[PDB]
Amino acid sequence: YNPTLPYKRPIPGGLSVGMSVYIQGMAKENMRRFHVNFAVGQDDGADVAFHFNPRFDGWDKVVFNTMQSGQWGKEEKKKSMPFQKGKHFELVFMVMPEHYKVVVNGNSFYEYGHRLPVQMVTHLQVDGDLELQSINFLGG
Amino acid sequence: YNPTLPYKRPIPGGLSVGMSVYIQGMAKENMRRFHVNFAVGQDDGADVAFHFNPRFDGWDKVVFNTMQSGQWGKEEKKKSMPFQKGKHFELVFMVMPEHYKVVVNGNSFYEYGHRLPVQMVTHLQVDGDLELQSINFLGG
Amino acid sequence: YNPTLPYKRPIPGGLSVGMSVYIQGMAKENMRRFHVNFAVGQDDGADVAFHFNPRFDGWDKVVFNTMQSGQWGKEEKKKSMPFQKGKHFELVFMVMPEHYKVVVNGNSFYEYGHRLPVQMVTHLQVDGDLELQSINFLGG
Amino acid sequence: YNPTLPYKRPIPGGLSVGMSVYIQGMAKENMRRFHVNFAVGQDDGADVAFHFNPRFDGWDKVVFNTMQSGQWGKEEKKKSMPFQKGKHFELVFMVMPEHYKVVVNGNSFYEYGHRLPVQMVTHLQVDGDLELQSINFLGG
Ligand SMILES: OC[C@H]1O[C@@H](O[C@H]2[C@H](O)[C@@H](O)[C@@H](O)O[C@@H]2CO)[C@H](O)[C@@H](O)[C@H]1O
Ligand SMILES: OC[C@H]1O[C@@H](O[C@H]2[C@H](O)[C@@H](O)[C@@H](O)O[C@@H]2CO)[C@H](O)[C@@H](O)[C@H]1O
Ligand SMILES: OC[C@H]1O[C@@H](O[C@H]2[C@H](O)[C@@H](O)[C@@H](O)O[C@@H]2CO)[C@H](O)[C@@H](O)[C@H]1O
Ligand SMILES: OC[C@H]1O[C@@H](O[C@H]2[C@H](O)[C@@H](O)[C@@H](O)O[C@@H]2CO)[C@H](O)[C@@H](O)[C@H]1O
Ligand code: NA
């Protein structure tokens, strides 16, 4: 009865500053990558205020970006991998006035400055090499 | 049917922290400069909480300033030009507690610390060497 | 009909984050010092969340402090004097989540981190070598 | 009639950004340590968004941590002791968007970045080598 992928669901009330999203799943044993998108609308090539994108590669890293008017911006990356193949994780996004704060398994991970206004984000999209267990929205 | 210049319109409800303004237009092919003012009232020499002022010069740059009791303060500038002559742009201002954040074509550009209280800004004024397409206020 | 000194008046609704105070007066020609206190209650030795205290001395400076349970804390100071003897000034305090931001004559001056919760401040007290013209509270 | 220890009480309305907690007690003469927990629920091994934990040791210090899904995260510490054995103290926590700000006896002490969303904290727990006099919640 776990959510199938791709997961795409509205954020109840829309995204607003002060909200958090909290995200339990498992990285697949053979994971290459997955993403979570804070999306502007329901369409499938919707703009994305915040794309959070762990990648196992040469350098295991997380990539962060925004898609606006259909175009990816300047990638930010952190060359650190807080997920592990085959392991359960807890992934939390907190929406602060200046940034999304990302916390993985209780460990602060990254702060991504807003590039598109928070109150454009209406949907959460999740897909890739993971199994999704729960998604809960808080404070909205 | 595009807006004529100078454009001067009230911000619905007044400016408040958490609001954004999003601004589509085109830099003219022969642009020297333009500005967007976050203005205190409707009069034509009203104070300006935030003047955003791209200038092609020797050094292509953006100038940022505040006019208070009729006098320009200390200019801030960034010696980088995110607009291009003859090209369409997307210009976003996000009103955070400490600053206006400016994002141009999806690329974070500048943070201008507040010098006059946000809740004095009642009007948006736009003028100069641009063609204006849309202005949308969000979160207010 | 200008306000007499010491000036002590309630802040309508109490102080809250997002509020500003804006303060027109004149430094006296023979000014040594003055202060503005964000006070906890109406009594005369009330605690003070934020004491803003320009001083002409050897080093012309502004002193910033908090009085809690009747005791002054660690002074902060900036060795710069934005007022001038005999001159009119505009003094603005903006209450942000992390600090009071002080702006004098349109020029950002200082950010004083909160030491006592903002929602303890109920009164504004002003006294010293100045003539007071106007005090206006915004956003509360 | 002072509160007995361990003290565990709900935060009226739940914790929210903008709230403060203010905490008068006395360090015991023979204090080794005490803590204040911002807890997620009433159970006794509840998760803890913020554990504030002064310790007299070799190095007198304060330890700060989060317990999530039953596990302590990466300790932060400050090798400074703002309490003193046998002395009364005033301990204030201010909940800002990015961090808890800790102020002890009027002196700013530490800012602890949020690791679990504020709006998960429902209870305050206090225990250890102290005598507790008052706990007051503000702005909620
Ligand atoms: O930036 C987020 C997107 O990256 C896209 O891939 C990039 C790649 O990371 C970069 O190195 C370069 O090769 O350009 C590619 C296309 O922009 C992914 O295709 C996309 O899914 C996002 O992860
Ligand atoms: O600071 C914003 C205003 O600048 C004014 O021009 C300045 C100029 O930039 C500066 O170098 C100096 O020469 O003083 C001028 C007058 O203050 C513009 O006239 C005004 O429109 C704003 O852009
Ligand atoms: O810190 C704000 C208060 O300062 C007091 O004076 C201080 C003085 O600045 C310091 O150098 C030292 O001498 O201790 C004095 C007493 O704490 C003023 O008396 C008071 O009005 C505030 O300005
Ligand atoms: O981090 C907060 C908790 O610390 C626990 O003790 C730690 C200790 O500080 C550390 O040095 C190491 O030895 O691991 C211990 C167990 O995680 C306390 O037991 C606990 O009460 C908290 O203070
Ligand atoms: Na902030």
Short mmCIF file of all heavy atoms in Angstrom, two decimals, chain A residues 33 51 53 55 63 65 72 75, ligand 1:
data_model
loop_
_atom_site.label_atom_id
_atom_site.label_comp_id
_atom_site.label_asym_id
_atom_site.label_seq_id
_atom_site.Cartn_x
_atom_site.Cartn_y
_atom_site.Cartn_z
N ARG A 33 20.11 7.54 -8.84
CA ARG A 33 19.63 8.85 -8.39
C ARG A 33 18.14 8.89 -8.10
O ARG A 33 17.42 7.99 -8.45
CB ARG A 33 20.05 9.98 -9.35
CG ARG A 33 19.83 9.78 -10.81
CD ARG A 33 20.24 11.06 -11.59
NE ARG A 33 21.59 11.07 -12.16
CZ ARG A 33 22.01 11.94 -13.10
NH1 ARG A 33 21.18 12.88 -13.57
NH2 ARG A 33 23.25 11.87 -13.58
N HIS A 51 14.52 21.67 -6.93
CA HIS A 51 14.82 20.32 -7.34
C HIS A 51 15.97 19.83 -6.45
O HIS A 51 17.10 20.38 -6.47
CB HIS A 51 15.27 20.36 -8.82
CG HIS A 51 15.71 19.04 -9.42
ND1 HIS A 51 14.83 18.02 -9.70
CD2 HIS A 51 16.90 18.65 -9.94
CE1 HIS A 51 15.47 17.03 -10.30
NE2 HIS A 51 16.73 17.38 -10.44
N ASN A 53 18.29 16.52 -5.64
CA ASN A 53 18.64 15.46 -6.58
C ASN A 53 19.95 14.75 -6.21
O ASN A 53 21.02 15.03 -6.78
CB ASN A 53 18.68 16.06 -8.02
CG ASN A 53 19.09 15.03 -9.13
OD1 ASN A 53 19.81 15.39 -10.07
ND2 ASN A 53 18.61 13.78 -9.03
N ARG A 55 22.74 11.97 -6.32
CA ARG A 55 23.29 11.20 -7.43
C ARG A 55 24.50 10.45 -6.97
O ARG A 55 25.45 11.08 -6.52
CB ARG A 55 23.73 12.11 -8.60
CG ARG A 55 22.70 13.10 -9.14
CD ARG A 55 23.31 13.92 -10.28
NE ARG A 55 22.34 14.84 -10.87
CZ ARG A 55 22.55 15.65 -11.91
NH1 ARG A 55 23.72 15.65 -12.54
NH2 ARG A 55 21.57 16.46 -12.33
N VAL A 63 22.65 17.37 -6.10
CA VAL A 63 22.51 18.49 -6.99
C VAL A 63 21.22 19.22 -6.60
O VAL A 63 20.25 18.59 -6.20
CB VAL A 63 22.49 18.03 -8.47
CG1 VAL A 63 21.90 19.10 -9.38
CG2 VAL A 63 23.87 17.65 -8.91
N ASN A 65 18.67 22.56 -7.89
CA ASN A 65 18.43 23.48 -9.04
C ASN A 65 16.97 23.95 -9.07
O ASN A 65 16.16 23.53 -8.21
CB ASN A 65 18.85 22.85 -10.40
CG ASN A 65 19.38 23.90 -11.39
OD1 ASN A 65 19.14 25.10 -11.23
ND2 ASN A 65 20.10 23.45 -12.41
N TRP A 72 16.53 24.80 -16.74
CA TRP A 72 17.33 24.61 -15.54
C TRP A 72 18.28 25.79 -15.35
O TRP A 72 18.91 26.25 -16.31
CB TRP A 72 18.17 23.33 -15.63
CG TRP A 72 17.33 22.11 -15.51
CD1 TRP A 72 17.13 21.19 -16.48
CD2 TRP A 72 16.52 21.72 -14.39
NE1 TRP A 72 16.27 20.21 -16.02
CE2 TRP A 72 15.88 20.50 -14.75
CE3 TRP A 72 16.32 22.24 -13.10
CZ2 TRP A 72 15.03 19.80 -13.87
CZ3 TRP A 72 15.47 21.56 -12.22
CH2 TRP A 72 14.81 20.35 -12.63
N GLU A 75 23.27 25.03 -11.37
CA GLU A 75 23.23 23.95 -10.37
C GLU A 75 24.06 24.39 -9.19
O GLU A 75 25.12 24.99 -9.38
CB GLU A 75 23.87 22.66 -10.89
CG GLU A 75 23.09 22.01 -11.95
CD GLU A 75 23.62 20.63 -12.38
OE1 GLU A 75 24.78 20.25 -12.08
OE2 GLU A 75 22.84 19.93 -13.04
O1 LIG E 1 20.32 20.60 -12.82
C1 LIG E 1 19.29 19.68 -12.51
C2 LIG E 1 19.02 18.79 -13.76
O2 LIG E 1 20.21 18.24 -14.27
C3 LIG E 1 20.03 17.63 -15.56
O3 LIG E 1 21.27 17.21 -16.05
C4 LIG E 1 22.22 18.20 -16.38
C5 LIG E 1 23.56 17.76 -15.80
O4 LIG E 1 23.52 17.67 -14.40
C6 LIG E 1 24.63 18.76 -16.20
O5 LIG E 1 25.90 18.28 -15.82
C7 LIG E 1 24.66 19.00 -17.71
O6 LIG E 1 25.12 17.82 -18.35
O7 LIG E 1 23.37 19.36 -18.19
C8 LIG E 1 22.32 18.44 -17.91
C9 LIG E 1 21.04 19.03 -18.52
O8 LIG E 1 20.76 20.34 -18.00
C10 LIG E 1 19.09 16.42 -15.48
O9 LIG E 1 18.79 15.91 -16.77
C11 LIG E 1 17.79 16.87 -14.79
O10 LIG E 1 16.95 15.78 -14.51
C12 LIG E 1 18.09 17.62 -13.48
O11 LIG E 1 18.71 16.77 -12.54
#
